[PDB]
Design a protein around this ligand. Sequence first.
Ligand code: NAP
Ligand code: 7DR
Length: 165
Amino acid sequence: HHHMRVSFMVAMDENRVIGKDNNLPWRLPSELQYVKKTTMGHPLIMGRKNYEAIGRPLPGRRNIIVTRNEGYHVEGCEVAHSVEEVFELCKNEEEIFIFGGAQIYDLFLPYVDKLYITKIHHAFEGDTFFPEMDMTNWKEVFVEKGLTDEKNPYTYYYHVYEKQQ
Ligand SMILES: NC(=O)c1ccc[n+]([C@@H]2O[C@H](COP(=O)([O-])OP(=O)(O)OC[C@H]3O[C@@H](n4cnc5c(N)ncnc54)[C@H](OP(=O)(O)O)[C@@H]3O)[C@@H](O)[C@H]2O)c1
Ligand SMILES: CCc1nc(N)nc(N)c1C#CCc1cc(OC)cc(-c2ccccc2)c1
């Protein structure tokens, strides 16, 4: 029914941790740059909590916030209240990025076509997790080692998986 590619954009640790106390458990500037490079010029779909932690519209992209609050408004941002409303708003887009957090990854899980997942080789303390996925009929189409240096102190890899459909 929907015609845009639904891509997930996520960074997770060895136990699928993505969050701690409503923030990111790590700091990787190089991984963020990969995120900016990959998502530039495409809509970002983000959970209300995710968006408010970010705190500002991200430039050069449609910012779409997902909330059950029908009175919710943010300057420079679009607001959706369901999967279908997101699909309506993005009906003419070629590709959209589900940008988190966990509730929003769970929401859009039945529809994901492409997975950009950074895997961080460390076990952090956390409270928020990326959902489990059955990767049957998916293929890894890209993999590369992230930059580990003084400013990026963990080992991590970029992975991209595409659904076979
Ligand atoms: N490592 C990563 O790649 C990454 C990426 C993104 C986020 N995170 C982290 O993950 C954590 C946030 O994730 P989270 O799961 O707590 O929050 P979230 O998914 O970003 O946002 C949750 C909110 O989304 C809205 N929502 C949920 N289900 C909905 C539905 N069915 N229909 C309409 N709206 C719905 C609700 O907003 P309302 O309450 O306003 O109704 C809900 O409170 C933070 O720690 C963040 O830093 C990590
Ligand atoms: C950067 C890890 C990350 N990596 C990957 N591979 N996917 C993701 N979805 C996220 C994520 C996230 C959530 C997040 C939280 C945040 O403040 C609390 C700021 C930004 C941000 C700030 C400036 C520009 C772009 C994004 C993103």
